[PDB]
Amino acid sequence: KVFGRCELAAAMKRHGLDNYRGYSLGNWVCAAKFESNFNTQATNRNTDGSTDYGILQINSRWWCNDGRTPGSRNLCNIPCSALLSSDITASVNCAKKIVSDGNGMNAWVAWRNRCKGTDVQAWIRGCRL
């Protein structure tokens, strides 16, 4: 499923991401836009044997089990396939753990390269939240 911008913003706000750990809703929508372009089915294989899954591109080496990643841990206790559903609940709950893992949102490289330090409030324009 491909979310509309505000549609995703509403979904995230509904799951408690607005201002979570001090990160405004705009930061999460911006991270989603550049990590997967709002596509819940987006996947990106990395050269280390792991793969990134879903709207927030969560990595299989430490967060979810896809059964084909060497020395992988499953800290979010879920199959990576669950991160590819139209319902973002699984992704959000896992993301909440990742953002509290000691690196803030720096865990998402696309957020760091395209959102960090910018006027993220723009990603929430026109939305009736």
Range of the domain at 65: 1-129
Contact in structure between 128 and 6 (CB atoms under 8 Å): yes
Among all residues, which ones are annotated catalytic?
35, 52
Q: Output the known binding site for substrate.
A: 101
Q: How many domains does the chain have?
A: 1
Annotated binding-site members: 101
Distance CA 42, CA 69 (A): 18
* CATH code of residue 73: 1.10.530.10
Method: X-ray
